[PDB]
Amino acid sequence: XXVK
Amino acid sequence: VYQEPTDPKFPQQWYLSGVTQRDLNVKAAWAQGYTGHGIVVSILDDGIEKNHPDLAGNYDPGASFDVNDQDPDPQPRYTQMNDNRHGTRCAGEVAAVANNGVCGVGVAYNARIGGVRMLDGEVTDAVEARSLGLNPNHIHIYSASWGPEDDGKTVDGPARLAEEAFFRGVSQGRGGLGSIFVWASGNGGREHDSCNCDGYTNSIYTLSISSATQFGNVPWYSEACSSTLATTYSSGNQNEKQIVTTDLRQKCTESHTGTSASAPLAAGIIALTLEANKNLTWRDMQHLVVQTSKPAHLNANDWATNGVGRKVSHSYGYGLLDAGAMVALAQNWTTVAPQRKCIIDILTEPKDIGKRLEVRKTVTACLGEPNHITRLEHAQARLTLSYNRRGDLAIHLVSPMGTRSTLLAARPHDYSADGFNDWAFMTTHSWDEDPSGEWVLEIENTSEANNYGTLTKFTLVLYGTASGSLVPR
Ligand SMILES: [Ca+2]
Ligand SMILES: [Ca+2]
Ligand SMILES: [Ca+2]
Ligand SMILES: [Cl-]
Ligand code: NA
Ligand code: NA
Ligand code: NA
């Protein structure tokens, strides 16, 4: 996987 | 007579108000008396600086938790790079305190604001589920400016616990009215990503929000897809202004950017709307967004008028949110009827894709049955197919009213040979249409390569009601  | 905020950076918050009309019409909601009093928003991110001088006055520990370290305190982890500033920046967009001589203001500057620290670590399915499901009878609105990788080759969505959290939230959350989940549609524009390949944005349970630049253009980072519902302003080129908000280490920033900044602004507007009518359901809120959002002056080459006269784009959904229009329409809103679900298994046999495949089916949309739908909300084409190079596929779905939704555009970087395994491509573009009649699915090879594969399942899933339509726009 989860990216900002 | 309403007095606008005096905060030092409020005049730089060009997206909240102005004589120019390139704004989200938030001051109009404030002047109607809606600033977010009594509404609770939680930022699911890398933490929240709960003692920030522009957040402390609105901070709500009941809206907060630290899932990464398993404690109640969502304070960010401080590093030299200031990696964990992202959640604080998102929070200030929603609910930065007003008229306190510090930075600017939130959209809902009297709302209560919390944060879930859940990105600063391995983001497992369980971590997501515990965050999405946090205190769902206290938190009204959840904002998520994160998701699957935007490399333009990933197909990824909530696993079982997270999906269960979505269903539990919309069903039993907020007293049974349903948790409101707001999602940033993505930063994959440069990689030609599709936000329909992201199960969080593609979910019917999330309001997926895209971005427009100050001059009304599709930002470089924007992802186009049919599941997007609406748009808020964010950053663009270096001549265009950016987003003003609270920053890590008790600072103020005027350079918050990207998809990340759009979802919190939508969450704030939804907070104002919920103050205007606390009885709104999760579906009511999506109806309000559809009816009130504004295409005007947003530039795109794919604007299309759907079957009920509403303009819709794959870059912008139904257009820019309009806070004043949202709060006005919320006040006398009649709750929508219970959601019906009509399942239509389309195929009688597998179909080779080859260079192009067209599947036509005339449906009755559960005529004669209690799940008869004459007023569509979301529609899904749940597709199971094999293909040798997935990103060479383009997939379109045409509704009986003639509205062509791009379910999947070509993804140059998607080399995968794994196909789609009952992937529920979703479109918002046929909202309020009658789904009875001929649906058309088109699958085509956009490349000159001799690609090959087979479509083995096509379930058309229709959601909606059988009552309450408006005269088309
Ligand atoms: Ca902690
Ligand atoms: Ca302030
Ligand atoms: Ca993406
Ligand atoms: Cl369902
Ligand atoms: Na319910
Ligand atoms: Na969604
Ligand atoms: Na029809």
Side-chain angles (χ1 to χ4, degrees):
Chain A
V3 305
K4 285 174 195 186
Chain B
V1 290
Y2 172 76
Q3 296 298 111
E4 72 183 15
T6 59
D7 305 63
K9 304 302 185 194
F10 172 67
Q12 296 167 248
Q13 297 187 276
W14 57 272
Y15 44 91
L16 297 180
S17 59
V19 289
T20 79
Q21 192 170 351
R22 309 189 306 194
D23 60 54
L24 298 166
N25 203 27
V26 172
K27 185 180 171 298
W30 294 340
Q32 288 180 249
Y34 303 111
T35 56
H37 271 119
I39 308 304
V40 175
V41 183
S42 182
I43 308 301
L44 307 185
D45 210 282
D46 58 14
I48 183 176
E49 191 168 75
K50 64 187 183 294
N51 59 337
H52 192 291
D54 231 17
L55 300 175
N58 288 334
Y59 178 69
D60 181 6
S64 304
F65 201 77
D66 180 343
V67 175
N68 292 132
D69 281 351
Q70 288 179 336
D71 70 64
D73 180 2
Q75 194 73 21
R77 178 174 61 89
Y78 292 94
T79 65
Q80 278 193 303
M81 283 177 72
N82 296 317
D83 306 82
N84 295 304
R85 64 182 192 186
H86 188 256
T88 293
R89 293 185 167 201
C90 294
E93 296 184 73
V94 181
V97 174
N99 296 302
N100 68 337
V102 175
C103 199
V105 308
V107 167
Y109 55 70
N110 280 325
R112 279 190 287 176
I113 188 70
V116 181
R117 181 166 176 260
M118 43 83 60
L119 294 178
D120 192 6
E122 192 194 359
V123 183
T124 62
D125 179 42
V127 162
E128 298 182 357
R130 298 200 326 264
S131 303
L132 295 165
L134 178 70
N135 209 3
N137 289 324
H138 182 68
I139 297 171
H140 298 121
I141 301 157
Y142 302 80
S143 189
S145 291
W146 52 265
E149 202 180 356
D150 292 328
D151 55 9
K153 53 180 182 178
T154 298
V155 183
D156 188 19
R160 179 171 171 172
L161 291 163
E163 179 52 33
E164 289 165 343
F166 278 136
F167 208 104
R168 294 173 72 83
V170 298
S171 302
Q172 289 88 38
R174 244 194 340 122
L177 301 174
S179 300
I180 307 297
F181 300 106
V182 183
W183 224 273
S185 65
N187 277 327
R190 168 178 44 158
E191 312 304 331
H192 303 278
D193 204 6
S194 159
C195 35
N196 282 357
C197 289
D198 173 340
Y200 300 85
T201 50
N202 191 58
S203 175
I204 73 172
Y205 305 123
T206 68
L207 297 98
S208 186
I209 306 300
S210 284
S211 304
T213 72
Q214 184 183 22
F215 303 162
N217 288 313
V218 178
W220 64 272
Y221 51 82
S222 175
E223 298 182 41
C225 65
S226 55
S227 61
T228 294
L229 195 65
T231 301
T232 62
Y233 285 113
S234 184
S235 62
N237 64 41
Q238 297 192 45
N239 306 97
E240 294 172 302
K241 292 296 182 180
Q242 302 184 334
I243 305 304
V244 177
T245 188
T246 50
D247 203 3
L248 201 62
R249 299 179 192 281
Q250 313 197 5
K251 285 136 79 176
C252 184
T253 185
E254 296 82 35
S255 50
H256 188 36
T257 66
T259 194
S260 294
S262 285
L265 293 172
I269 293 177
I270 291 165
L272 304 184
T273 305
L274 251 200
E275 193 189 359
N277 182 346
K278 291 212 68 188
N279 300 331
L280 292 168
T281 71
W282 70 277
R283 281 165 56 240
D284 285 331
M285 190 64 67
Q286 294 194 30
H287 282 271
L288 289 174
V289 166
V290 170
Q291 292 193 17
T292 61
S293 294
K294 299 298 195 298
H297 302 144
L298 293 178
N299 302 310
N301 72 357
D302 75 326
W303 279 113
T305 300
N306 71 9
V308 295
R310 295 203 183 101
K311 287 199 185 169
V312 68
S313 160
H314 294 80
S315 289
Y316 301 123
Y318 287 91
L320 273 174
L321 297 178
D322 177 344
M326 286 281 282
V327 298
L329 185 64
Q331 288 171 59
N332 274 116
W333 182 261
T334 298
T335 313
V336 293
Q339 187 215 55
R340 307 175 175 203
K341 177 182 185 178
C342 179
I343 301 166
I344 308 153
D345 218 17
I346 301 284
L347 300 189
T348 58
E349 59 169 19
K351 306 276 178 157
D352 277 343
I353 295 166
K355 173 63 176 183
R356 181 167 191 280
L357 170 69
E358 179 163 310
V359 179
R360 296 171 174 173
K361 177 72 165 139
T362 296
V363 310
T364 67
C366 292
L367 185 68
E369 313 167 353
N371 48 339
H372 184 218
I373 295 163
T374 65
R375 277 188 77 192
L376 193 67
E377 290 173 359
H378 321 78
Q380 294 164 329
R382 304 197 181 182
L383 304 184
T384 304
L385 62 89
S386 54
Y387 208 64
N388 66 299
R389 181 172 179 102
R390 196 164 55 192
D392 286 355
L393 293 170
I395 306 179
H396 295 83
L397 183 67
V398 189
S399 78
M401 295 295 290
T403 304
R404 188 164 196 259
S405 292
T406 302
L407 296 184
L408 183 64
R411 287 206 304 168
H413 300 302
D414 185 6
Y415 60 78
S416 169
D418 296 334
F420 291 103
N421 179 20
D422 193 39
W423 187 261
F425 296 96
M426 190 269 281
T427 181
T428 63
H429 293 200
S430 288
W431 200 278
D432 281 328
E433 293 178 8
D434 189 332
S436 171
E438 185 198 21
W439 288 81
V440 184
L441 187 74
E442 301 155 349
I443 303 177
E444 53 197 353
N445 177 12
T446 63
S447 71
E448 308 292 357
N450 297 310
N451 297 335
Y452 55 93
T454 308
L455 177 70
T456 62
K457 191 189 290 174
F458 170 19
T459 319
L460 184 69
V461 182
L462 311 168
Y463 295 96
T465 61
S467 67
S469 287
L470 286 61
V471 175
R473 178 165 300 168

